[PDB]
Structure 1
Amino acid sequence: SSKAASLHWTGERVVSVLLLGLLPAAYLNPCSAMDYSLAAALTLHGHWGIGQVVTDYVRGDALQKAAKAGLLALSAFTFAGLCYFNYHDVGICKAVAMLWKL
C-alpha cells in the first residue's frame, strides 16, 4: 500500500527546480563540483522525462518493459559518459565556455 506514484511525481518536480537552480549557479562560479551535479540532474530529469513519453505512447506491456530497459541503458551510458568527460576532459561548463568563445 505504498505511495510510489506520488513520490515519483514529487521527485520529478524536485530535480526540476534543482536543475533550474543549477543553470544560473553554473554560469556564476563554474567548477568541478558543478559539472558532476549538472550531469546528475541533466540525465536524471531527462530520464524521468522520457519515462513519461514512453508510458504515454508505447502501447502494450511487452514493448513497455523493453523501452524502459532500453532507455535505462541509454541513460546509464549518458550519465557515465558525462562523468568521464568531467574527470578525463575539460568538463561541461568549460566545454560550453569554449564553444561560446568560438
Structure 2
Amino acid sequence: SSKAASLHWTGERVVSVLLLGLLPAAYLNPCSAMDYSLAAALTLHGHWGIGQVVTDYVRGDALQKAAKAGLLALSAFTFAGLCYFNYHDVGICKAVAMLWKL
C-alpha cells in the first residue's frame, strides 16, 4: 500500500524551491557550507530532471535499464566532482566570483 510516485513528484518540487532559495543565498552568504548544499541540490534536481526525459523518450526494457544506470553513473561522478572541487579547490561560490570579474 505504498505511494512512491507521488512522493517522488513531491520531492522534485521541494528540491526545486530549495535550489531557487539557494541561488540568492549563495550570492548573499558565499561559504564552504553553501558550496556543498549547492553541490547537493544542483546534482539531485538535475538527476531527477533527466530522469523524466529518459522516461519520456527512451522506449524499451533493455534501453531504459541502461539509460537509468548510465545517468546514475554520471550523477554520481558529477556530485563527486563537485565535492572534490569544494574540498581541494576554491569551491563553487569562489569559482563563479573569480570567473565573473574577468
Shift of 1:22: 0.1
Unaligned 5+ runs, structure 1: none
Which ranges of 4 or more aligned residues in structure 1 deviate by more than 6 Å?
none
Note the alpha carbon deviations across 1:30-86, whole angstroms, 9 max, x for none. 000000000000000000000000000000111001000000000000001000000
Cα RMSD for the two superposed structures: 0.4
Could you tell me the TM-score, scaled by structure 1's length? 0.99
Note the alpha carbon deviations across 1:78-99, whole angstroms, 9 max, x for none. 0010000000000000000000
Aligned length: 102
Unaligned 5+ runs, structure 2: none
Shift of 1:19: 0.2
Partners in 1 of 2:61 and 2:53 — Cα distance? Answer: 15
Partners in 2 of 1:53 and 1:61 — Cα distance? Answer: 16
Partners in 2 of 1:33 and 1:10 — Cα distance? Answer: 25
Shift of 1:28: 0.3
Shift of 1:18: 0.2
